[PDB]
Design a protein around this ligand. Structure first.
Ligand SMILES: *C1=[C@](F)([C]N2[C]([C][N]C3=[C][C]=C(C(=O)[N][C]([C][C]C([O])=O)C([O])=O)[C]=[C]3)[C][N]C3=C2C(=O)[N]C([N])=N3)C(=O)[N]C(=O)N1[C]1[C][C]([O])[C]([C]OP([O])([O])=O)O1
Ligand code: C2F
Ligand code: UFP
Lengths: 287, 287
C-alpha cells in the first residue's frame, strides 16, 4: 500500500485515540506517545501528496544544517522563513537570551552535526577543526565499515541544551547498510503532525538520498520513530480535511550530477519529478 | 494480547525475513532495521516468561548505572558478571586501551547519565558535581512540568565514544506523562535479541517504576524501539526452542517502602511477585 497511508493513519489514530495534553506554546494538543512508520526510498521519494509540501523549505533547511549554520537568518535569505519565529528578538528574550543577536538559535542541529562537543560562542564564530564532525564520520563509516552498528548522528547534547532556542525535535538518527542499500532511522522526540512531520519525513529521506549518492549505495528505507506525536488543536479541522484526500503516487528525486562530498551539494543539484499534490492546506505555527 | 508475544513475534520475524549481516564480534547475525513494541507496565511487569530471565542481574546492573559506576568489577562483586568480558584485559587491549585497568569500561552509561560532559579520567575518579546529571533533571522535570516534550536521558556522547569499551546499546530514552501515567521510550541502536534485549526490556521497565514511585505517578508503557535488531547465529537454535513456549502471565513488581530519591533505592526495596518462567535457556555471549 501507499507509504503516505502510514502518516494518514497516524494522524487519524491521534484524532481518534489521542489524549488531551497541554504544551509549551499554550496551544493545546491531542497526543500519543510512541509511533513508528517505514517509508520506502526505492525508486520513490516520500514527499506527501495529500497537501502541497514546501519542498524548497525542506531542501534549503537541510543544506543549512549541513553547512553547520545556527543562524536562522541565513535560511531566511533563501526566502525560507520557518526558523524566524524561534530566532526572533521576542522569542529569544522570552528564554532569557537578551544578549545574543536575533537569529542566533544557539548550538542546535548544524553545530552539533559538524562540531559536537566544541565550545559554542555565537552563530558567527569559526569552529573549523573543533568538535566531532558526526556527519563526516557517518559517511566515512558507511564507506569503510558498513556493518557497523554505531552509525549515528546525534543533535541531542545535554551540556548545550540550556543555550538552545529550541532543543532538537529530530534528536538522533542512525544509518544501516545491507544488500547494497542505505537505510536511516530518526528518533524524533516531538512531532507536530501538521507542520513539522511532513518536513521531517522529506528531510531525512533527502539526507539518505544524499549520503547514498556519495557512498555509492541505493536508498533503502526511512524509518520514522516518534516520541510525543501530537496534533495542535488549531490543526484538527485542517487535518480532518487532509485525511479524506486520496494520495497520489509519490514523486521521484533525481540528483543531476555526480557529487563527491556532502558539503558540495547545492539546490540546483536536485529535481523532484512527478509531484502531483492536492492543494496547500494552511496551518498556523505554534511559537 | 500478552505483551511478550511482541518480543516473540520480533524474534520470529528476524528468523524468517532477516538478512544475513556480518558483525563486529565475528559471530554473524540475521538482522532487521527498525522495530517497535509497547509493553504495558500497568499492574504488571514485563519480565519475560518464555525463559527464566536473570532478574538479579537486571536489578544490580540498573543500580550500578544509577550510582554512576563504569567499573565492571563493581557489578561483578554483586555476583553479576555480564559486563566482565567487555572490560577484560584482552578486550581492552584489542581496542588500544593497553594501560587501562581491567574492568574500566570508560565513560559509558553510569558516567553519561549522571555526569554528561565531564572529563573522564578513570573508573575510580570522583566526578561529584561535574557534568550534567541527566537522571536527576528527568525526575525534576517530571515533577515540575510533566507536559515537557524534552524529558530525555542520553548516553550517546560522540565526544567520548573513542574512550568507551562499548558504545551504548541503549542510546537515548525519553519519558512522557499523560493520564497520571509515566511512560518511557528507549531508542536502542543495537539489540542482541537473545541476551541483551530481554534485559533491556526489564531494565527500562524497572527504571520507569522507580521514577514513577519518586514522582507520584503510575507506570504507563515502555515503548521499545530498535535500530539493528539481530539474532546471533549461535542463538538461532535456542531461540527456536523459546518460540515453542507459551508465555505465562507477567509477574508484578512491588516497591517495599517509600523511597524519596533515585539514589536511595537498594536491592532490598524490590520484590518480583508471581514470576512463573519456563526453564532457563543457555545462550553464549558474543564478545
Ligand atoms: C520541531 C522541529 F524542529 C520543527 N519546527 C521548526 C520550524 N519548522 C517549521 C516552521 C513553520 C513551517 C511552516 O509554516 N510550514 C509551511 C507549511 C507546511 C508545508 O508545506 O510543509 C509553510 O509555512 O509554507 C514549517 C516548518 C521549529 N519550531 C517548530 C517546528 C514545528 O514543526 N512546529 C512548531 N510548532 N514549531 C521539527 O523538525 N519537527 C517538529 O515536529 N518540531 C515540532 C515539535 C513541537 O510541536 C515543536 C517543538 O516544541 P517542543 O515543545 O517539543 O520543544 O516543533
Ligand atoms: C547488553 N550487552 C551485550 C553485550 N554483548 C552482546 N553480544 N550482547 C549483549 O546483549 N555487551 C554488553 C552488554 C552485556 N550484557 C549482558 C547481559 C546478559 C548476558 C548473559 O550472558 N546473560 C545470560 C546468563 C546470565 C546469568 O544467568 O548469569 C542469560 O541467559 O541472560 C551477557 C551480557
Ligand atoms: C549491548 C548492550 F549493552 C545492551 O544493553 N543491549 C544489547 O542488546 N547490546 C548488544 C547489541 C549488540 O549485539 C552488542 C553490542 O555490539 P555493537 O552493536 O556495539 O557491535 O550488544
Amino acid at each position: 500500500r501507499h507509504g503516505e497511508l502510514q502518516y494518514l493513519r497516524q494522524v487519524e489514530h491521534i484524532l481518534r485515540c489521542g489524549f488531551k495534553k497541554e504544551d509549551r506554546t499554550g496551544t493545546g494538543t491531542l497526543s500519543v506517545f510512541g509511533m513508528q512508520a517505514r517509508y520506502s526510498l526505492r525508486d520513490e521519494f516520500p514527499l506527501l501528496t495529500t497537501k502541497r509540501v514546501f519542498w524548497k523549505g525542506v531542501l534549503e533547511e537541510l543544506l543549512w544544517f549541513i553547512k553547520g549554520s545556527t543562524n536562522a537568518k541565513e535560511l531566511s535569505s533563501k526566502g525560507v522563513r520557518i526558523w524566524d519565529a524561534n530566532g526572533s528578538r521576542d522569542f529569544l528574550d522570552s528564554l532569557g537570551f537578551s544578549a545574543r543577536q536575533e537569529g542566533d538559535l544557539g548550538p542546535v542541529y548544524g553545530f552539533q552535526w559538524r562540531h559536537f562537543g566544541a565550545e559554542y560562542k555565537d552563530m558567527d564564530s569559526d569552529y573549523s577543526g573543533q568538535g566531532v564532525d558526526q556527519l563526516q564520520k557517518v559517511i566515512d563509516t558507511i564507506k569503510t565499515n558498513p556493518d557497523d552498528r554505531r552509525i549515528i548522528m546525534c543533535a541531542w547534547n545535554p551540556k548545550d541544551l540550556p543555550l538552545m532556542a529550541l532543543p532538537p525535535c529530530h534528536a538522533l538518527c542512525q544509518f544501516y547498510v545491507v544488500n547494497g542499500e542505505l537505510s536511516c532511522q530518526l528518533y524524533q522526540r516531538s512531532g507536530d503532525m501538521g507542520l513539522g512531520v511532513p518536513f521531517n519525513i522529506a528531510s531525512y529521506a533527502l539526507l539518505t538520498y544524499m549520503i547514498a549518492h556519495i557512498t555509492g549505495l541505493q536508498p533503502g528505507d526511512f524509518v520514522h520513530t516518534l516520541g510525543d506525536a501530537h496534533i495542535y488543536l488549531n490543526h484538527i479541522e485542517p487535518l480532518k480535511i487532509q485525511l479524506q484526500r486520496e494520495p497520489r503516487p509519490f514523486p521521484k528525486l533525481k540528483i543531476l550530477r555526480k557529487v563527491e562530498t556532502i558539503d558540495d551539494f547545492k539546490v540546483e543539484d536536485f529535481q523532484i519529478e512527478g509531484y502531483n499534490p492536492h492543494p496547500t492546506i494552511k496551518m498556523e505555527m505554534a511559537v
